[PDB]
Amino acid sequence: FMRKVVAEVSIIPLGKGASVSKYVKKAIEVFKKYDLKVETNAMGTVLEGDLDEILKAFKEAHSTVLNDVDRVVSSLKIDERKDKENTIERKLKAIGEL
Amino acid sequence: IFMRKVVAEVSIIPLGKGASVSKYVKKAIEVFKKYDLKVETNAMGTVLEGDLDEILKAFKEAHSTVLNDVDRVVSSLKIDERKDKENTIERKLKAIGEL
Amino acid sequence: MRKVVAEVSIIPLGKGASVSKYVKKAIEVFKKYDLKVETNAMGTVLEGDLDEILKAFKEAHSTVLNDVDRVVSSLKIDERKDKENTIERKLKAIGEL
Amino acid sequence: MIFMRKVVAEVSIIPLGKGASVSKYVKKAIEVFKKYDLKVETNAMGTVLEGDLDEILKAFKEAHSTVLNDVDRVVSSLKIDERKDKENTIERKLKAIGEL
């Protein structure tokens, strides 16, 4: 990485009803192809790594799901700072989660 | 006796105090322990599982707790609810093989 | 009165292509409350009491859930205590009014 | 605008700096978006964009980065709504929602 950040992604296919886990699992598999730390939770997936890699993984993940459906709503949230390292563990420690 | 279970995610961001906002966020998270909710904090937000009304109240309090020490706060609440299957963190994670 | 400016986005997960149909229903719900409502292409901005917004949010979400099996709704709140916060004030502060 | 893959999006660039006021930084981000080949419609909680997906991703990164140059931390969000069965435009969504 050159410019590390911490992010969270959510990819939701529309028009396929409520059972969409099969599509979401596909998106998660996409992130794992990149040089990123992947921590999936029940409402999205947190990523740690190069900003460009995250942007590319986000687009691919979104696009992969869209390939199987007609509409997808995807969200990408980036948290980047200059005063400290941008890592998952640092954020967790800062709030006493470790 | 009445449980309308949903899974949600909350993020509270205090503004005007620079980059170091963890001290405020920690306080907001503490609030959740007072409610009958499952709490799973991650690096970008806090996932909650429990009654919808309880999550709405916990959200308002967490938001307000931070606003007490800062001048401005931007808070987000996302709700995921379905009526065909149980709304639990465990089931969602199992469904995608994370458990 | 505890005024805030907020944004609500509701995603209904159905098997048809028209979601706007259900979202329109959610927007009508907002209008039953004492709130200023400004809908845009990605969500609806609300201005009014925090409690009223929380109630309106819950009802809008629930109304859509009555038509589809799953709904993902988001509520974002921007509250400040140093100044009065309103839709028009926020817009003018950035020269977008 | 010029595109190969049009989508409708909403962005919010939140600077974590000194003082509750962030208007200066927010306007800076908005000016960045306007420099790209996109339709820009700012509302009180975010900025809606219409244009090519890649142009939006580029604009997003630059807006986020330009704000980060002035403050020590930035939390930026991008939400994309893309469909293949109908055109992805602000106008269509507004007409479909009863606003136009």
Could you tell me the end-to-end alpha-carbon distance of chain A, in angstroms, rounded to an integer? 24
For D66, the token pair is: 């330009």
Side by side, the strands of the sheet bearing A44-50 are A37-41, A44-50, A4-14, A71-81, D73-83, D6-16, D47-52, D39-42
Q: Which CATH class is domain D1-100?
A: alpha beta
**Euclidean distance between the first and final Cα of chain B, in Å?**
29
Could you state, in order of their start, the residue ranges of all structural domains in chain D? 1-100
| Helix spans in B1-99 (H) | 22-32, 52-67, 89-95
Say which CATH topology domain C1-97 has: Alpha-Beta Plaits (3.30.70)
Of D57, D77, D81, the CB nearest to A59: D57
Residue D1 to chain C, least CA–CA distance (Å): 18
Helix pair D53-68, D23-35: axis angle to 10 deg: 150
- Partners of B16 on chain D (C-beta within 8 Å) are 17-21
- The count of residues in chain C is 97
Contact (CB<8Å) A17/C68: yes
> How crowded is residue D75: how many other Cβ atoms within 10 Å of its Cβ?
23
Rg (CA), chain D: 14
**B68 DSSP assignment:** T
Nearest-Cα distance to chain D for B15, in Å, is 6
Restricting to B residues 3-32, those with a Cβ less than 8 Å away from any Cβ of D are 13, 15-19, 21
Quick one: fold of B1-99?
Alpha-Beta Plaits (3.30.70)
Where helices occur in chain C by DSSP H, the ranges are 20-30, 50-65, 87-93
In this complex, which of B15, B74, B79 lies closest to C61 when CB atoms are compared? B79
CA angle C19, C22, D81 (to 5 degrees): 35
User: Contacts of residue D20 in chain B, CB cutoff 8 Å?
Assistant: 15-16, 70-72
Residue of chain A with shortest Cα separation from D75: A79
Resolution of the model in angstroms: 1.8
Residue C53 and residue C35 in contact, taking contact as beta carbons nearer than 8 Å: yes
**Cβ neighbours, 10 Å, residue B51:** 17
Residue B33 forms contact with C (CB below 8 Å) = no
Q: Across the interface, do A42 and B40 touch by the CB < 8 Å criterion?
A: yes
Kindly list the residues from chain D whose CB atom is less than 8 angstroms away from the CB atom of residue B13.
14, 16, 75
CB D68 within 8 A of CB D74: yes
As a whole number of angstroms, the distance between CA C57 and CA C63 comes to: 10
Reduced to 3 states (helix: H, G, I; strand: E, B; else coil), residue D100 is coil
Contacts of C23 in chain D (CB under 8 A): 97
Q: Structurally, what CATH architecture does the domain formed by A1-98 represent?
A: 2-Layer Sandwich (3.30)
Task: Write the single-letter amino acid at C47.
Answer: E
Task: Judge whether A96 is closer than 8 Å to chain C, CB to CB.
Answer: no
Spatial distance between the Cα atoms of C26 and C24, rounded to a whole number of angstroms: 5
- Three-state SS string over D83-94 comes to ECCCCCCHHHHH
Cβ contact, residue pair B60, C50, below 8 Å: yes
- Phi, psi at A64, each rounded to 5°: -65, -40
> How far is residue A47's CA from residue A55's CA, in Å, rounded to a whole number?
11
Experimental technique behind these coordinates: X-ray
Residue B66 in tokens: 């931070």
